[PDB]
What we know:
Layout: E1 2-9, E2 13-15, H1 25-35, E3 39-43, H2 44-49, E4 61-65, E5 77-79, H3 82-85, E6 91-95, H4 97-103, E7 109-116, E8 126-127, E9 136-139, E10 143-144, E11 150-157
The structure holds NADPH dihydro-nicotinamide-adenine-dinucleotide phosphate and ligand WRB.
Amino acid sequence: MVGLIWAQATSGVIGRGGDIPWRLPEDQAHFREITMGHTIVMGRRTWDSLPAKVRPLPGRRNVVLSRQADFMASGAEVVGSLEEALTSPETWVIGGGQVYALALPYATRCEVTEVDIGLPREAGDALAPVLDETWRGETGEWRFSRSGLRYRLYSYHRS
Ligand SMILES: NC(=O)C1=CN([C@@H]2O[C@H](COP(=O)(O)OP(=O)(O)OC[C@H]3O[C@@H](n4cnc5c(N)ncnc54)[C@H](OP(=O)(O)O)[C@@H]3O)[C@@H](O)[C@H]2O)C=CC1
Ligand SMILES: CC1(C)N=C(N)N=C(N)N1OCCCOc1ccc(Br)cc1
């Protein structure tokens, strides 16, 4: 089982300037709850973007994809190919744009957080993968974050 988990603006934007262009602490808790105790896979850029206090993310086996054979990621398993990364039975791909696109075909689940923020795509942005008709989904109720932004959760699947 390979799953993808991400938070996106309605526009599809998930990253800009090496960051996540919004604040939504409630999403942090959701991400943690889904991924806790499992293997997580991320691209090297996503690894770099992790705040040092949570690098590596606790209680999870951190796997980092990089083309540099000798890249140093303390507390994480550096692998050079997708096949080396997706070996665990329950793997959660946690970003970024390049890795989501790379792992989507191996995925049978997507846990998505839509953030109701006006944020038109700009060149160079990290973007969420687009889910086609092979996916069946359930949409949750809109909720207000203490940061003022509305957000809702989607759970997609395919067999
Ligand atoms: N909103 C959300 O849910 C999330 C948003 N983000 C945001 O996404 C952005 C980062 O995304 P993005 O730039 O797309 O980067 P990625 O996180 O997807 O990392 C890309 C890197 O992964 C490695 N890589 C990619 N393909 C391969 C391959 N086929 N084999 C080996 N290594 C490979 C490379 O490492 P190298 O260059 O070392 O070879 C590459 O530079 C940031 O802005 C971040 O904040 C990240 C996660 C979640
Ligand atoms: C966007 C986020 C978090 N939430 C969803 N639903 N899915 C993601 N893949 N997540 O990104 C994971 C990589 C960055 O996560 C962290 C974790 C803790 C801190 Br502190 C800062 C960043």
